[PDB]
Enzyme design. Structure first.
Site, PDB file in Angstrom:
ATOM      1  CE1 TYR A  32      -1.744   3.427   2.708  1.00 46.13           C
ATOM      2  CE2 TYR A  32      -3.212   3.085   0.833  1.00 46.13           C
ATOM      3  CZ  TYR A  32      -2.761   3.872   1.880  1.00 46.13           C
ATOM      4  OH  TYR A  32      -3.331   5.105   2.100  1.00 46.13           O
ATOM      5  NE  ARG A  67      -5.531   0.394   3.010  1.00 43.59           N
ATOM      6  CZ  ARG A  67      -4.408   0.029   3.625  1.00 43.59           C
ATOM      7  NH1 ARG A  67      -3.772  -1.086   3.277  1.00 43.59           N
ATOM      8  NH2 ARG A  67      -3.914   0.786   4.595  1.00 43.59           N
ATOM      9  CE1 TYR A 148      -7.997  -1.349   6.335  1.00 44.69           C
ATOM     10  CE2 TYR A 148      -8.039  -3.567   7.265  1.00 44.69           C
ATOM     11  CZ  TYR A 148      -8.705  -2.455   6.778  1.00 44.69           C
ATOM     12  OH  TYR A 148     -10.080  -2.441   6.731  1.00 44.69           O
TER      13      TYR A 148
HETATM   14  N1  NDP Z   1      -5.737  -5.663  -1.090  1.00 45.44           N
HETATM   15  C1  NDP Z   1      -6.967  -5.718  -0.580  1.00 45.44           C
HETATM   16  O1  NDP Z   1      -8.046  -6.222  -1.332  1.00 45.44           O
HETATM   17  C2  NDP Z   1      -7.213  -5.234   0.821  1.00 45.44           C
HETATM   18  C3  NDP Z   1      -6.189  -5.280   1.766  1.00 45.44           C
HETATM   19  N2  NDP Z   1      -6.462  -5.072   3.095  1.00 45.44           N
HETATM   20  C4  NDP Z   1      -5.390  -5.121   4.104  1.00 45.44           C
HETATM   21  O2  NDP Z   1      -4.380  -4.162   3.843  1.00 45.44           O
HETATM   22  C5  NDP Z   1      -3.093  -4.703   4.079  1.00 45.44           C
HETATM   23  C6  NDP Z   1      -2.265  -4.596   2.799  1.00 45.44           C
HETATM   24  O3  NDP Z   1      -0.948  -5.065   2.991  1.00 45.44           O
HETATM   25  P1  NDP Z   1       0.331  -4.096   2.833  1.00 45.44           P
HETATM   26  O4  NDP Z   1      -0.021  -2.916   2.024  1.00 45.44           O
HETATM   27  O5  NDP Z   1       1.514  -4.895   2.461  1.00 45.44           O
HETATM   28  O6  NDP Z   1       0.563  -3.676   4.365  1.00 45.44           O
HETATM   29  P2  NDP Z   1      -0.033  -2.351   5.038  1.00 45.44           P
HETATM   30  O7  NDP Z   1      -1.152  -1.733   4.299  1.00 45.44           O
HETATM   31  O8  NDP Z   1      -0.444  -2.707   6.404  1.00 45.44           O
HETATM   32  O9  NDP Z   1       1.266  -1.428   5.130  1.00 45.44           O
HETATM   33  C7  NDP Z   1       1.483  -0.336   4.280  1.00 45.44           C
HETATM   34  C8  NDP Z   1       2.740   0.313   4.821  1.00 45.44           C
HETATM   35  O10 NDP Z   1       3.190   1.288   3.914  1.00 45.44           O
HETATM   36  C9  NDP Z   1       3.755   2.361   4.631  1.00 45.44           C
HETATM   37  N3  NDP Z   1       3.494   3.624   3.925  1.00 45.44           N
HETATM   38  C10 NDP Z   1       2.324   4.335   3.837  1.00 45.44           C
HETATM   39  N4  NDP Z   1       2.553   5.435   3.082  1.00 45.44           N
HETATM   40  C11 NDP Z   1       3.845   5.431   2.688  1.00 45.44           C
HETATM   41  C12 NDP Z   1       4.601   6.301   1.910  1.00 45.44           C
HETATM   42  N5  NDP Z   1       4.028   7.337   1.302  1.00 45.44           N
HETATM   43  N6  NDP Z   1       5.934   6.012   1.680  1.00 45.44           N
HETATM   44  C13 NDP Z   1       6.513   4.874   2.214  1.00 45.44           C
HETATM   45  N7  NDP Z   1       5.755   4.014   2.981  1.00 45.44           N
HETATM   46  C14 NDP Z   1       4.447   4.294   3.211  1.00 45.44           C
HETATM   47  C15 NDP Z   1       3.162   2.355   6.032  1.00 45.44           C
HETATM   48  O11 NDP Z   1       4.187   2.478   6.990  1.00 45.44           O
HETATM   49  P3  NDP Z   1       4.752   3.912   7.454  1.00 45.44           P
HETATM   50  O12 NDP Z   1       3.651   4.711   8.110  1.00 45.44           O
HETATM   51  O13 NDP Z   1       5.880   3.693   8.429  1.00 45.44           O
HETATM   52  O14 NDP Z   1       5.276   4.647   6.245  1.00 45.44           O
HETATM   53  C16 NDP Z   1       2.468   1.012   6.146  1.00 45.44           C
HETATM   54  O15 NDP Z   1       2.972   0.248   7.218  1.00 45.44           O
HETATM   55  C17 NDP Z   1      -3.302  -6.139   4.538  1.00 45.44           C
HETATM   56  O16 NDP Z   1      -3.250  -6.192   5.944  1.00 45.44           O
HETATM   57  C18 NDP Z   1      -4.708  -6.477   4.105  1.00 45.44           C
HETATM   58  O17 NDP Z   1      -5.335  -7.374   4.995  1.00 45.44           O
HETATM   59  C19 NDP Z   1      -7.738  -4.813   3.515  1.00 45.44           C
HETATM   60  C20 NDP Z   1      -8.780  -4.760   2.595  1.00 45.44           C
HETATM   61  C21 NDP Z   1      -8.516  -4.972   1.243  1.00 45.44           C
END
Ligand code: NDP
Length: 182
Positions: A32, A67, A148
Site C-alpha cells: 500500500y 487496498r 492496516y
Molecule cells: N488488497 C486488498 O483487497 C485489501 C487489503 N487489506 C489489508 O491491507 C493490508 C495490505 O498489505 P500491505 O499494504 O503490504 O501492508 P499495510 O497496508 O499494512 O502497510 C502499508 C505500509 O506502507 C507504509 N506507507 C504508507 N505510506 C507510505 C509512503 N508514502 N511512503 C513509504 N511508505 C508508506 C506504512 O508504513 P509507514 O507509516 O511507516 O510509512 C504502512 O505500514 C493487509 O493487511 C490487508 O489485509 C484490507 C482490505 C482490502
C-alpha cells in the site's frame, strides 16, 4: 513495572546502493505504501537498469497487497514493468531462501513474520511473503509504524533487516538517481 525493548537498524542511501550492487538476485515486495506514494515509476526504471546489468530482479505480489486485489499488478503495469517479472506470492514465495536482497517497499502486513512466529497473533496463520528468509532485507517505509492490521512486525528487529526510512517515492527516486550515476 514492566518494560520491553526492540532494536532496529537504519541504513543510508549509499549503504542501500552498496547492498543493491552487491546483490545478484533481488525480490521486490510492494504494498500500500508504494500505492500511496505513487512509487511504481522510479522502481520500474530502477529494475530496468538493474536488469540491464545482469541482475535477477523480480516483484513478489501478495494476493491482498494494497487496498484492492490485484492493485499492485495494475500500478506496476502502468509503470511499464514487464509482466514476466511480476510474480504472485504462491509462485515466488519458495525462492526467498535463495535470494540475496529483498526490497520491501511500502509493505508490512503482507510481509509480517508474526503470522508464523506468534501463535497469539491476530494474523497468526495468515499467508505472508517470507521475506525474512533471504540474505538481506531492506524495508522502505516512513518509519516503524503499523499497517492496516495495526500490528507490530517482528521483521523490523531481525538481524538481516535494515530500515530505509522515508517516503517510498522519494527513496525510490534517490536510489534510481544514484544507480543511474554509473
Ligand atoms: N488488497 C486488498 O483487497 C485489501 C487489503 N487489506 C489489508 O491491507 C493490508 C495490505 O498489505 P500491505 O499494504 O503490504 O501492508 P499495510 O497496508 O499494512 O502497510 C502499508 C505500509 O506502507 C507504509 N506507507 C504508507 N505510506 C507510505 C509512503 N508514502 N511512503 C513509504 N511508505 C508508506 C506504512 O508504513 P509507514 O507509516 O511507516 O510509512 C504502512 O505500514 C493487509 O493487511 C490487508 O489485509 C484490507 C482490505 C482490502
Amino acid at each position: 513495572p514492566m518494560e520491553i525493548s526492540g532494536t532496529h537498524t537504519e541504513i543510508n542511501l549509499d549503504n542501500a546502493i552498496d547492498m543493491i550492487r552487491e546483490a545478484n538476485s533481488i525480490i521486490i515486495t510492494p504494498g500500500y505504501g508504494l500505492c500511496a506514494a505513487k512509487a511504481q515509476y522510479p522502481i520500474a526504471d530502477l529494475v530496468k537498469m538493474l536488469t540491464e546489468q545482469g541482475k535477477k530482479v523480480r516483484f513478489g505480489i501478495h494476493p491482498v497487497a494494497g487496498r484492492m486485489p490485484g492493485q499492485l499488478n495494475v500500478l506496476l503495469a502502468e509503470a511499464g514493468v514487464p509482466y514476466d517479472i511480476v510474480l504472485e506470492m504462491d509462485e515466488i514465495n519458495h525462492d526467498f531462501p535463495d535470494t540475496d536482497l529483498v526490497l520491501v517497499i511500502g509493505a508490512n502486513d503482507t510481509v509480517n513474520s508474526a503470522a508464523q512466529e506468534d501463535p497469539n497473533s491476530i494474523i497468526a496463520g495468515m499467508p505472508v511473503l517470507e521475506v525474512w528468509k533471504s540474505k538481506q532485507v531492506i524495508v522502505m517505509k516512513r518509519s516503524l509504524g503499523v499497517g492496516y492490521a495495526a500490528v507490530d512486525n517482528p521483521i523490523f528487529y531481525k538481524p538481516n533487516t535494515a530500515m530505509l526510512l522515508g517516503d517510498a517515492k522519494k527513496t525510490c527516486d534517490a536510489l534510481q538517481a544514484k544507480v543511474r550515476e554509473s
